[PDB]
Design a protein around this ligand. Structure first.
Ligand SMILES: [Mn+2]
Length: 380
C-alpha cells in the first residue's frame, strides 16, 4: 500500500505535530476568515482539458473561451493528473484528503477501494461542515468506485445519483449520450441553502467516454495523422466541451446572485483518452495536465500557482479565501508552495517537507495512528 519512511516513529510524528502547530498559529495571525463561513463546491469536470495544449490538434473554434476568461480572473492554472483517460476517483480522493497519490505504492489502483477503508477516522475538508450540509453528486451509480461507502463514512446527508441511493436528480436532461452538466449545475443551485454553510462534492458525467454530438456543427476538429474515428471522437468531445463552457459560465453567474460567500474548486480529472501519444509531439508532459480554477462569488484574489497537484486544492482553497488553517493544512500549505509537483525532487528543502508529509500520510493510512494522540493536529 505504501512504504514506511525510514524515520517513522512516535517521536517523529510528535516533532511534526508541534512544528506545524506553531506554523499554523503564525499563518493564522495573517489569515482573516474561517472556512466554515464559506460554502465550498468541489467540482470534478469529467475529462475536461483544453485541447489547445495538444500540439498536433486543430479545432475550428475556441471551445473553452468562458472558462479561460474565468481562469484569468482568479486563482487558476494547470493541474497535474496521475492517469490518462481514466482514474476519476483517485483525483477525487486526493482533493478531499489532500494525500498525494505519488507517495503511495504503484500497486494501488483505486484509492477508494484499497486505502480509504483502511483509514482510521479519515480527515477531509468536509469535516468542517455539519453532516446535514454535506452533499455529494454523481450522475451514475452511487456504488461506482465505492463512492457510496466513502460518503456514508464521511457523514454526508445526501448523495444524488442515477441509482444506488435514495437521492435523485431533478429535471434530468442529456447533452450527448449522458447527463448534461446543465442538469448537474441546476441541481447544485436547487440545494444551495443561504442560511447554511454547505460543502458539495460533485463528479460530472457529460464528457465521459463515449462522446457523441452532432452540434454545434460548425465546430470541427482534426489531428495530424489521426484516423477518421479519432478525428470524430475529438470533434464530438470538442463540441461537448463547448456546452460545458457556456453552462459553467451561467452556473457561476447564478452563484453571484446568492447572498452567501461561495467558492468553487473546478478541475478536470484527466485528459480524455481519445488522443494518440503522437498528438503531443514535443510536449508529452501535456498528456497529464488539465485545467483548474478556484473561484469565489465575491471578490477574487489571483494567487500564483501555475502548476499544482490534485492534493493541493484544499491548501490552495484556504490561501485563496484567506481562511485560518489547522496544523495539518499548515503542512499542506508548505507543500503547496515549496514541495509540490512544480519543484525539483532533488532539492533538499523539497525532500524535508515531503518527508514530513510521508510520515503523516503513512500514520493515517496503514501506520500506527500516532496522530490520534495529537488531538489538535486536524482542528483549526
Ligand atoms: Mn474521469
Amino acid at each position: 500500500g505504501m512504504e514506511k519512511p525510514t524515520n517513522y516513529s512516535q517521536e517523529t510524528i510528535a516533532s511534526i505535530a508541534q512544528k506545524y502547530q506553531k506554523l499554523a498559529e503564525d499563518i493564522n495571525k495573517d489569515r482573516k476568515n474561517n472556512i466554515a463561513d464559506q460554502t465550498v463546491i468541489y467540482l470534478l469536470s469529467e475529462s475536461l482539458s483544453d485541447p489547445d495544449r495538444v500540439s498536433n490538434v486543430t479545432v475550428s473554434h475556441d471551445v473553452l473561451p468562458n472558462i479561460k476568461a474565468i481562469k484569468n480572473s482568479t486563482t487558476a492554472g494547470l493541474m497535474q493528473s496521475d492517469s490518462y483517460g481514466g482514474g476519476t476517483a483517485n483525483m477525487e480522493f486526493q482533493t478531499l484528503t489532500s494525500l498525494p497519490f505519488y507517495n503511495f505504492s504503484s500497486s494501488v489502483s483505486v484509492l477508494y477501494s484499497e486505502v480509504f477503508p483502511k483509514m482510521a477516522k479519515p480527515h477531509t475538508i468536509s469535516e468542517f461542515y455539519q453532516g446535514k450540509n454535506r452533499i455529494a453528486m454523481h450522475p451514475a451509480s452511487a456504488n461506482n468506485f465505492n463512492r457510496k461507502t466513502v460518503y456514508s463514512n464521511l457523514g454526508f446527508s445526501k448523495f444524488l445519483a442515477l441509482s444506488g441511493s435514495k437521492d435523485k436528480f431533478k429535471n434530468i436532461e442529456n447533452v450527448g449520450l449522458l447527463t448534461s452538466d446543465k442538469t448537474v449545475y441546476n441541481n447544485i443551485l436547487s440545494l444551495i441553502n443561504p442560511s447554511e454553510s454547505q460543502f458539495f462534492s460533485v463528479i460530472t458525467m457529460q464528457n465521459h467516454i463515449p462522446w457523441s454530438s452532432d452540434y454545434p456543427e460548425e465546430i470541427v476538429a482534426e489531428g495530424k495523422n489521426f484516423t477518421e474515428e479519432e478525428n470524430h471522437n475529438l470533434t464530438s468531445y470538442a463540441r461537448l466541451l463547448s456546452f460545458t463552457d457556456k453552462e459553467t459560465r451561467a452556473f457561476l453567474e447564478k452563484l453571484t446572485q446568492i447572498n452567501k460567500p461561495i467558492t468553487v474548486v473546478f478541475y478536470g480529472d484527466h485528459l480524455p483518452g481519445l488522443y494518440p501519444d503522437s498528438a503531443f509531439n514535443k510536449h508529452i508532459e501535456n498528456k497529464y495536465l488539465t485545467d483548474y480554477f478556484i473561484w469565489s462569488n465575491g471578490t477574487n484574489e489571483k494567487k500564483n500557482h501555475p502548476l499544482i497537484n490534485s492534493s493541493d486544492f484544499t491548501a490552495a482553497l484556504f490561501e485563496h479565501t484567506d481562511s485560518k488553517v489547522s496544523p495539518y493544512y499548515a503542512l499542506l500549505t508548505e507543500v503547496l508552495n515549496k514541495a509540490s509537483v512544480d519543484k525539483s525532487p532533488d532539492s533538499p528543502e523539497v525532500k524535508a517537507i515531503q518527508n514530513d508529509l510521508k510520515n503523516i500520510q503513512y500514520d493515517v493510512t496503514i501506520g500506527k495512528g500516532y496522530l490520534l494522540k495529537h488531538k489538535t493536529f486536524f482542528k483549526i
